[PDB]
Design a binder for this molecule. Structure first.
Ligand SMILES: O=C(CCc1ccoc1)N1CCCC1
Ligand SMILES: O=C(CCc1ccoc1)N1CCCC1
Lengths: 193, 193
């Protein structure tokens, strides 16, 4: 049921810690979840569909966490308010680096992974632009760039920079410095004249 | 000679306008360059090596243009000095979008394409950090983030945002707004307290 399904998802997330989706067979997932290969196909149509569900859960987990923040404003200054929002992504994706890495690789080959990512990026950018506009309306931020274009560049910077950090790419910001680095660039570009 | 070699490179850059490297065969490049398939193999070991050379030429072209700028400072204010530097990348990669797109796709599968990209990204980030430090030493920019970490995030933002613009990704900044968008974020984050 949701038991064999969860077992399959947990197995795939464990195996993805060690090798790419290419080195993982349906037999590996089935054996890890303690079921046969034809039984696997009753829960998922392919190993690609397993990754899509894992990605969908992590993305939604990030999106729900940001919604919670939105509904429960922290009582602190502006720089800290941005930091707690960026942190949702740093901690949610940073707690699932194997899925994040595999999902990024699948954007190239999977229309559904590309559309899921694109849909949520559009939503986070529109939320970011809405916050910038509210700040501009209250006179706390200057009318500089179009808010939506500024939001789009800053969300793409975060996608790329967090991802480089979590993958240990050359070049990357160390993971223990990446939150501070991004918050500085967001605050200075949103509030700077 | 350099004639048959150039013909092969021009053919591959033309074909890459229309389809991915996967849909292009060695026979396609040979026929386009007016030579046989075994003759092709005398100039390049594979279609992947053709892409690597095209990428190497565009990268070096960008790097030499930035060096020229470095050696011949423009007589203008700071925001314009950053704009002319970012522009080197916007115009060089923007004039070769098919190669840029294919080269980005090959980073996943080619160690040599990944190393070429990584080597030049490290050089541009180190140059960027050196400029920020000079500005800090002369008292024109505040000592906020570590210069090299700030440089790394801004160069990764440019890589990702320019690339999204040139590929017409969803989401992306329109190509006619992307230079202005990036220059704002660089200037406010480098000079903002
Ligand atoms: O940091 C963000 C968004 C940060 C943020 C803060 C408020 O709204 C979005 N992203 C990383 C991957 C995709 C987007
Ligand atoms: O915009 C830049 C660099 C811009 C810049 C200006 C000065 O030094 C680097 N990049 C795009 C792809 C890789 C780096």
């Amino acid at each position: 049921g949701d038991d064999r399904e969860l077992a399959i998802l947990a197995t795939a997330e464990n195996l993805l810690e060690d090798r790419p989706l290419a080195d993982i067979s349906v037999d590996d997932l089935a054996k890890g979840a303690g079921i046969s290969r034809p039984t696997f196909y009753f829960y998922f149509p392919s190993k690609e569909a397993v990754l899509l569900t894992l990605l969908d859960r992590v993305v939604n987990q990030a999106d729900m966490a940001l919604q919670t923040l939105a509904e429960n404003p922290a009582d602190t200054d502006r720089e800290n308010m941005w930091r707690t929002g960026i942190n949702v992504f740093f901690e949610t994706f940073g707690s699932h680096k194997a899925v994040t890495r595999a999902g990024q690789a699948a954007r190239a080959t999977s229309v559904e992974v590309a559309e899921l990512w694109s849909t949520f990026m559009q939503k986070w950018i529109a939320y970011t632009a809405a916050v910038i506009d509210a700040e501009r309306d209250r006179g706390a931020a200057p009318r500089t760039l179009p808010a939506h274009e500024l939001a789009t560049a800053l969300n793409l910077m975060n996608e790329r920079t967090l991802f480089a950090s979590f993958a240990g790419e050359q070049p990357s910001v160390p993971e223990a410095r990446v939150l501070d680095t991004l918050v500085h660039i967001w605050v200075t570009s949103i509030y700077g004249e």
